[PDB]
Amino acid sequence: HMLNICFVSTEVAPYSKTGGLGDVTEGLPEELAKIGHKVCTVAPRFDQYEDAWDTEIIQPVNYGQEKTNVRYFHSYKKGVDHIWVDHHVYLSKTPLVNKKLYGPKDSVDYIDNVERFAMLSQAALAVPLLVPLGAKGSQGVMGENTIFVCNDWHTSLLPLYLKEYYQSQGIFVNAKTVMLLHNIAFQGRFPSSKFDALNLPAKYLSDLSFNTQFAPPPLDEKTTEPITSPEPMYMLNWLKAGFLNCDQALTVSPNFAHEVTSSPMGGVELDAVARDVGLTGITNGTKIETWNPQKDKFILANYNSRTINSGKKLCKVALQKECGLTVDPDIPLFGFIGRLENQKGADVIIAAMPKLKQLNCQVVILGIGSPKLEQELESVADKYPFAKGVARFDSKLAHFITAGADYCLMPSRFEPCGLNQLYAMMYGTIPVVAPVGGLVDTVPPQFGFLMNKIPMPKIPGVTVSEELLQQGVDAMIVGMKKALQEYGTPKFKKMRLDCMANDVSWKKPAAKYVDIFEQLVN
Ligand SMILES: C[C@H]1O[C@H](O[C@H]2[C@H](O)[C@@H](O)[C@@H](O[C@H]3[C@H](O)[C@@H](O)[C@H](O)O[C@@H]3CO)O[C@@H]2CO)[C@H](O)[C@@H](O)[C@@H]1N[C@H]1C=C(CO)[C@@H](O)[C@H](O)[C@H]1O
Ligand SMILES: Nc1ncnc2c1ncn2[C@@H]1O[C@H](COP(=O)(O)OP(=O)(O)O)[C@@H](O)[C@H]1O
C-alpha cells in the first residue's frame, strides 16, 4: 500500500531551479502523490517563498564544526509537501530570487559548500520525525518507515548521517536510502582537509577516499581554472561514499547507467564503484501542464496534432520575426536551448556557422554561461544572417523556439537524460541529438535523428582543441543532413505526428520507481 517517500535536493521547481534536476523533483513527486503515496521534498530555503509558512520547529545541526539551528518552513501543493530548510547561509547569499544557488559566478562555487550541503543532509533527516504533513499539517509526521531519495552529490552524505546519527541509536532502523544520480560529472570532490567539517567518525574515511589527477578549482571563491595534476592526488568524494552507503543507486536513463558502469570515461572515474554497487536507469518523464501546444500560455497560436499545419506554421513565422530572421515557413529551422557549457556543445554550433550556410536552414540559439561564449553568441547574427543568438534566460523565447522550430538540436557531449527533446516531441518538433546517454533512449528512429559522437576534451578542464571542436562540427552536421533529407516530405509530417503521440509523462517511469521502492521495504 502507501509508501513514505522523502526527496532531498538543492532544487525544486518552480521555487528553485538551474536546470533539469528541479523539474524532476517537481514532476516525479507529484506523480507519486497522484498514485496515492505520501511524498515530501526537502530543500534549502533560498528565498522567502510566499506560499510557505514557518512551522515554528527548530532543529540543532552542525555547520562545519559550529553548532547551529535550522527552522523549517512548509508549503503544500498538488498533494506534495515541500519542506524548506531555513538558515542565514541559504537565504542571505544574494537578494536576487532563484540565482546563485551554488556560487557567485558561473563556474565558481561558494567556499562553504561543504558546510552548507552537509547541513542540508542533517536537517532533512529530522523532517520525517518532526514536520506534520498535509494541508496545514493536519496529517501528522511521515515517521520512521521512510525512503529517502537523495538527489545528486549535494545530498550524498545523507546515508552516512542516517547510519551514524540515527540508526546507531535505533531510530530509522527500517528507513531506506536511494541515491538518485542526475549527473556524474559533479561528485562532491573536496580536499581531504575538509574531512573534519563533516562531523563523521573515521569509519567512513575509506568510503569517502579517492585518488585522481582532476580536482575542481580551489576553494577561494574566484579561481575558475581546475587543478589538473601529473600525479594522482588524495581527496574526498561524497558521491562515492553515497554510492557505497545507500540501499540502492538509480539514475535517469538506462543507457546512461550503462555508460557509467562501462568505463572510466563514462562514469568519470566512478565506474567501478557503480558496478560494485549496481546502478539502474529509469528514463525521466515530464509534466504536461506548462509544456504542451494545446494550452501553452506564451506562444502566438495553440495547436494539437490535427491543427499542427495551421498553428505551428504561425508559431514558426512568429519565431522567425522575433529573431530577425527572414520570414518563410519553408526554410527548415533548428533550435537550441541550453547552458553554454562543455556538456551541451553550444561551442560546436557557433563554430559550425561557416559550414552551415550550405545547408539552407535557420538556427536559433538560446543559453547562458561563459561570458565569452555569451559574447560570441550575440555576435552570430552579424556574420550569419540565417542564425540568431540570445544570451539570456528567457522562458517566453524558449516556448517560441520549442513550438516554432522544426528541429530541436542537442549536440551534447554527454547527457544523462535531457529534457528539451521531450518537450520538443510534445510540440511535434523533431529532435536531432547526439548519440549519448538518455538521448539514445528517448529519440529512437521513429521520432528523430542521431548525430555522430561529439568528442570530449582530451582531459576535463582543458578547453577543447580546435581539432576536436571541428570533429564535433562535422559530427553534428551529419545528423542535421540526415534530418534535412526528409524535411517537408510525407515522412516529415508523419514523424511530427508520431512525436506528438509519444507519451513522455511521469506515469510509466513513476510506476518503475514504485516497483523499486516496494522491493526495498519488503
Ligand atoms: C543542470 C544541472 O544542474 C545541477 O548541476 C549543478 C551542480 O550540481 C553544481 O555543483 C554546479 O556545478 C558547478 C561545479 O560546482 C563547479 O565546481 C564546476 O567547475 O562548474 C559547475 C557549473 O557548471 O552547478 C551545476 C549547474 O547548475 C544538477 O546537479 C545536475 O543534475 C543538472 N543536470 C542534469 C539533470 C538532469 C535531470 O534529470 C538530466 O536531464 C540532465 O541530462 C543532466 O544534465
Ligand atoms: N537560457 C535558457 N532559457 C530558458 N530555458 C532554459 C535555458 N537553458 C536551459 N533551459 C531549460 O532548462 C532545462 C534544462 O534541462 P536538461 O535539458 O535536463 O538540461 P540540464 O543538463 O541543464 O538539466 C530545460 O527544460 C530547458 O528548456
Author numbering: 0 to 521
Give the authors' words.
Starch Synthases (SSs) transfer glucose from ADP-Glc donor to elongate pre-existing glucose chains via α-1,4-linkages. SSs are retaining glycosyltransferases classified within the GT5 family in the Carbohydrate Active Enzyme (CAZy) database. Here we present three new crystal structures of SSs of different families and origins: the crystal structure of the catalytic domain of SSIV from Arabidopsis thaliana (AtSSIV), of GBSS from Cyanobacterium sp. CLg1 (CLg1GBSS) and of GBSSI from the glaucophyte Cyanophora paradoxa (CpGBSSI). In all cases, they are in the closed conformation forming ternary complexes with ADP in the donor site and the inhibitor acarbose occupying the donor glucose and glucose acceptor sites that approximates the active site at the time of the reaction.
The crystal of CLg1GBSS contains three crystallographically independent protein molecules in the asymmetric unit of which one (chain A) is bound to ADP and acarbose, one (chain B) is bound to ADP and glucose from the cryoprotectant and the third chain appears to be a mixture of the two, although ADP and acarbose were modeled in the electron density. Two loops were disordered and not modeled in chain B, and its glucose is bound in a position equivalent to that of the last hexose, the amino-pyranose, of acarbose in chain A. The crystals of the catalytic domain of AtSSIV and of CpGBSSI both have two crystallographically independent SS molecules in their asymmetric units. The structure of CLg1GBSS has, in the same crystal, a protein chain (chain A) bound to ADP and acarbose and a protein chain bound to ADP and glucose (chain B). Changes in the conformation of the protein accompany acceptor binding: The loop between Ser15 and Gly18 adopts different conformations in both cases, with the largest movement corresponding to Thr17, whose hydroxyl group moves 7.1 Å to bind to the acarbose. The loop between Lys92 and Asp108 is disordered and absent from the model in chain B. In chain A, in the presence of acceptor, it adopts an ordered conformation with Asn97 bound to the main chain carbonyl of Lys16, with Tyr101 forming a stacking interaction with the second glucose in acarbose and with Asp108 binding the glucose in the reducing end of acarbose. The phosphates of ADP adopt a different conformation in chain B of CLg1GBSS, with the proximal phosphate moving by 3.6 Å relative to chain A. Nevertheless, it appears that it is the presence of the acceptor itself, and likely of this C6-O6 hydroxyl group in particular, which creates steric impediments that force the phosphates in the donor to shift from the preferred extended conformation in the absence of acceptor to that observed in the presence of acceptor and which, presumably, is the one conductive to a reaction. The glucose in chain B supports this locus as that which is occupied by the glucose in ADP-Glc.
